[PDB]
Amino acid sequence: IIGGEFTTIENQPWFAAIYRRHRGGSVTYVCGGSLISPCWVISATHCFIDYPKKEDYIVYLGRSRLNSNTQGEMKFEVENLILHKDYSADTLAHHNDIALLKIRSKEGRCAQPSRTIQTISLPSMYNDPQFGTSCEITGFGKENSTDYLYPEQLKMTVVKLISHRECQQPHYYGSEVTTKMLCAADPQWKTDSCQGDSGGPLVCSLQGRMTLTGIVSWGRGCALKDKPGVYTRVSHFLPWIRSHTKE
Ligand SMILES: N=C(N)Nc1ccc(CC(=O)c2ccccc2)cc1
Numbered sequence: 001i002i003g004g005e006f007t008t009i010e011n012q013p014w015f016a017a018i019y020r021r022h023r024g025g026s027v028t029y030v031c032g033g034s035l036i037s038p039c040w041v042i043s044a045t046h047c048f049i050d051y052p053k054k055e056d057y058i059v060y061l062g063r064s065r066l067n068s069n070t071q072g073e074m075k076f077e078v079e080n081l082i083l084h085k086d087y088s089a090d091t092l093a094h095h096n097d098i099a100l101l102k103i104r105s106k107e108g109r110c111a112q113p114s115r116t117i118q119t120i121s122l123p124s125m126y127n128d129p130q131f132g133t134s135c136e137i138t139g140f141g142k143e144n145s146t147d148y149l150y151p152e153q154l155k156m157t158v159v160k161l162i163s164h165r166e167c168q169q170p171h172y173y174g175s176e177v178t179t180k181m182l183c184a185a186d187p188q189w190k191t192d193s194c195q196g197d198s199g200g201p202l203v204c205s206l207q208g209r210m211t212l213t214g215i216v217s218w219g220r221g222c223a224l225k226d227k228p229g230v231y232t233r234v235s236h237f238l239p240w241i242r243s244h245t246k247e
Pocket residue numbers: 046094192193194195196197198199216217218219220221222223224227228229230
């Protein structure tokens with residue numbers, strides 16, 4: 001996250017931190033995600049496409065720091081890793097960038113809600129906030145494009161939703177952005193998502209209710225003028241989500 005503020009997991013209880021195990025014992029951060037139900041975490045497919053082996057992943061809930069433990073955190077294994085079959089990546093754009101991870105503790109249990117672990121609500125069919133609406137994003141991503149390390153503490157910032165007409169302008173992303181995506185940015189182009197924030201949630205207050213409206217997917221550079229962050233439009237994947245989470 002470029003700009004913004006450092007935060008704690010108590011203020012973003014649905015945030016899931018995903019790591020990948022490596023030969024030897026090193027565990028590196030891979031992507032963010034969101035808890036949509038006790039047993040399910042939603043993220044982005046571009047995070048796992050190159051290494052689709054569920055056994056090599058670890059999911060943490062209730063965690064505020066990148067490399068240290070947090071009181072109340074819970075560790076999970078991945079029972080099932082579901083990637084979108086029509087995922088694809090062009091020069092910049094990533095299509096159908098959404099994924100589901102069924103989690104389970106060593107005892108075989110799902111998440112137990114607490115002050116630091118809570119689910120986030122899914123949107124209704126084609127029910128997105130009006131453009132111009134302020135929403136928040138959260139992640140352990142880079143603070144500057146020139147950085148090569150990620151911050152140790154979780155961050156968050158607020159960005160505004162941009163219309164498809166504006167985001168499709170030539171100086172923006174032209175025809176690369178589709179109706180299955182959502183653009184969001186800071187009117188001053190000072191804050192934005194960045195490398196390492198992928199999979200994370202774009203949360204918007206829709207009718208007094210915190211709703212998971214987007215998933216960090218792609219964008220040209222970070223916090224550059226006329227180059228908004230692009231998010232997977234969750235409301236357009238409800239069918240896919242429901243069919244896969246059932247049984
Ligand atoms: N202007 C932005 N907001 N840009 C931006 C948006 C999302 C990402 C997610 C990410 O980390 C990633 C995506 C594809 C491949 C590898 C990593 C990165 C930068």
